[PDB]
Design a protein around this ligand. Structure first.
Ligand SMILES: *[C@@H]1O[C@H](CO)[C@@H](O)[C@H](O)[C@H]1NC(C)=O
Ligand SMILES: *[C@@H]1O[C@H](CO)[C@@H](O)[C@H](O)[C@H]1NC(C)=O
Lengths: 49, 98
């Protein structure tokens, strides 16, 4: 469920810029391409908005 | 923050900003447009609304002084202490005594 999408992205500093989906490997993905599945409460997947 | 017109005074209002460069204000703000389902150019009921759009100082230092406008009466052959209020963001990083 975790949607971290702001109204405006709140990109403080010198300038603002919009949101975008990343591209990187994940512990979720490590257990996926491993082949198996798991249940756990800790932060495994990335917080995809 | 609603207000009311004083007999001697107009609306003199502030709004605390904690947001981004693009900002736009208005009063009589029951809507943005009346209810534009259609008019088919017959006639449009249009009362006046004072909507304003403003923009920001592009200050990467974020340290600046705001100068209120003295757009009122002015007797000549005088001096006039201008009223200005400022900030320094991050304090001064090193700065100096002066
Ligand atoms: C207008 O603002 C005053 C000041 O806080 C508040 O007490 C009052 O409830 C407001 N009036 C309205 C429209 O309720
Ligand atoms: C809001 O006004 C306060 C003073 O009451 C000021 O310090 C602040 O910079 C303004 N906006 C914010 C919260 O950044």
């Amino acid at each position: 469920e975790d949607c971290i999408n702001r109204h405006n992205v709140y990109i403080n500093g010198i300038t603002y810029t919009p949101v975008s989906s990343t591209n990187e490997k994940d512990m979720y993905s490590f257990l996926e391409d491993m082949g198996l599945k798991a249940f756990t409460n800790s932060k495994i997947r990335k917080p995809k908005m | 923050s609603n207000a009311t017109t004083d007999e001697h005074g107009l609306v003199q209002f502030s709004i605390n900003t904690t947001n981004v460069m693009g900002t736009s204000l208005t009063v009589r703000v029951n809507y943005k447009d009346r209810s534009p389902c259609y008019g088919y150019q017959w006639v449009s009921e249009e009362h006046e609304e004072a909507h304003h759009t403003a923009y920001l100082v592009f200050s990467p230092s974020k340290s600046f002084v705001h100068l209120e406008p003295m757009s009122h009466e002015l007797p000549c052959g005088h001096t006039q202490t201008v009223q200005a209020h400022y900030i320094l963001n991050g304090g001064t990083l090193l700065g100096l005594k002066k």
